[PDB]
């Protein structure tokens, strides 16, 4: 319940939290504030729980998509970036953390899923989704696999679902229409259908999750996987000669990944607000600060223009920018949690066989717009 001296930070496990701790030091030994960093479980679901009682971390990291609900629940502080600072970050990243005009977080990095392939097995990576089933038929005969990604989190299948048409919330004259949802239109159904078909034709397993797929690929068992910049660290460690490129098209439409902006929001019940502003504005959001977290686990494209300039040389980041470009930037409205819940079940249910695509996506549309 508060700290009055020190900064407690919270950031997901697949993020470079040990590097964040690095930055905490250069900030402590420079000012004298002891910065503790944590990677609790389901922090996105727990931060609001604790922050309600007036506890939790001083700073919480998470993709902007959850920040509108937090802001609504009154758990976040309005940040004070002057006209000068904001100039350092891309204007569209500031739009990501803007809840009703107000700014409720500092954009850290822009994330987008990309197609990671095994250069030795697949020197010529598939360009259409449609050519994957025949590709797996050939590979299955070599003991190998064509593709494997986490089906347990909708974020991973959304690119295919959005490709020929699906969408979360329609953007109208200035706002997102919470009643106009596209989880059950013709394109949403086609996309998921194609995925259900892959499974039914045994070119994929409906149980695959993050662990399983990171293993299949890093061990050299599957020719491809779909993951984020944060996944490159464990791959470099395996040494697998991989490539990061544009996701496959579907029905000729590029895959459309939901774009996330890693962000640092200040707890509303924190007494160290000025510290958080200082830590984030002058230490983290520097070239050195971000570079300290990127060395641990890649952030992907960063909000900081000065550091992104040094990062866009990397083809993995070039590929990240191209997929983000072809995808839509996520909404931050409180409804995004209802959306993700509903769509998670639909995809999970549809994949196992518990519901038909039609039944799944229909139930989601109903739950979401209820």
Ligand X SMILES: O=C[C@H](O)[C@@H](O)[C@H](O[C@H]1O[C@H](CO)[C@@H](O[C@H]2O[C@H](CO)[C@@H](O)[C@H](O)[C@H]2O)[C@H](O)[C@H]1O)[C@H](O)CO
Chain positions contacting ligand X, by CB under 6 A: 12, 14-15, 44, 61-63, 65-66, 111, 153-155, 228, 260, 262, 340
**Toward ligand X, which CB reaches closer, 70 or 340?**
340
User: Cβ 209 to ligand X, closest distance in Å?
Assistant: 10
125 or 154: CB nearest ligand X: 154
Min separation Cβ 342 and ligand X, Å: 11
**At its nearest, how many Å lie between ligand X and the CB of residue 218?**
17
Looking at beta carbons only, is 12 or 86 nearer to ligand X?
12
Considering the complex, state which of residue 218 and residue 332 has its C-beta at the smaller distance from ligand X. Answer: 332
> What distance in Å separates the CA atoms of residue 281 and residue 85, rounded to the nearest whole number?
8
End-to-end Cα distance, the chain: 36
Q: Of the two residues 29 and 42, which places its CB atom closer to ligand X in the complex? A: 42
Identify the CA nearest to 193 among candidates 160, 218, 233: 160
Q: How far is the CB of 61 from ligand X (least distance, A)?
A: 6
- Tell me whether residue 41 or residue 82 sits nearer to ligand X (CB atom): 41
Minimum distance from residue 334 beta carbon to ligand X (Å): 12
Report the nearest approach of ligand X to the CB of residue 141 (Å): 32
The span from the CA of 98 to the CA of 317, in Å, is: 25
């Amino acid at each position: 319940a508060i700290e009055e001296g020190k900064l407690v930070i919270w950031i997901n496990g697949d993020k470079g939290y040990n590097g964040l701790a690095e930055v905490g030091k250069k900030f402590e030994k420079d000012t004298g504030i002891k910065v503790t960093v944590e990677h609790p479980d389901k922090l996105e679901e727990k931060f609001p729980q604790v922050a309600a009682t007036g506890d939790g971390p001083d700073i919480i990291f998470w993709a902007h998509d959850r920040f509108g609900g937090y802001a609504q629940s009154g758990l976040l502080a309005e940040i004070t970036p002057d006209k000068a600072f904001q100039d350092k970050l891309y204007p569209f990243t500031w739009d990501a953390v803007r809840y009703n005009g107000k700014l409720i977080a500092y954009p850290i990095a822009v994330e987008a899923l990309s197609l990671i392939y095994n250069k030795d097995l697949l020197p010529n990576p598939p360009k259409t989704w449609e050519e994957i089933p025949a590709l797996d038929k050939e590979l299955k005969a070599k003991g190998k696999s064509a593709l494997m990604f986490n089906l347990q989190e909708p974020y991973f299948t959304w690119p295919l679902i959005a490709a020929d048409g699906g969408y979360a919330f329609k953007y109208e004259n200035g706002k997102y229409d919470i009643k106009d949802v596209g989880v059950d239109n013709a394109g949403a159904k086609a996309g998921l259908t194609f995925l259900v078909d892959l499974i039914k034709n045994k070119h994929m397993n409906a149980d695959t999750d993050y662990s399983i797929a990171e293993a299949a690929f890093n061990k050299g068992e599957t020719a491809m996987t779909i993951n984020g910049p944060w996944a490159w660290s464990n791959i470099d460690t395996s040494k697998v000669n991989y490539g990061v490129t544009v996701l496959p098209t579907f029905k000729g439409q590029p895959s459309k990944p939901f774009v996330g902006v890693l962000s640092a929001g200040i707890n509303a019940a924190s007494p160290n607000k000025e510290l958080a502003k200082e830590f984030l504005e002058n230490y983290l959001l520097t070239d050195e600060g971000l570079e300290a977290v990127n060395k641990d686990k890649p952030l992907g494209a960063v909000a900081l223009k000065s550091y992104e300039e040094e990062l866009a040389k990397d083809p993995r980041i070039a590929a990240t920018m191209e997929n983000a470009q072809k995808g839509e930037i996520m909404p931050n409205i409180p409804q995004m949690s209802a959306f993700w819940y509903a769509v998670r079940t639909a995809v999970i249910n549809a994949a196992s066989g518990r519901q038909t695509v039609d039944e799944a996506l229909k139930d989601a549309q109903t739950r979401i717009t209820k």
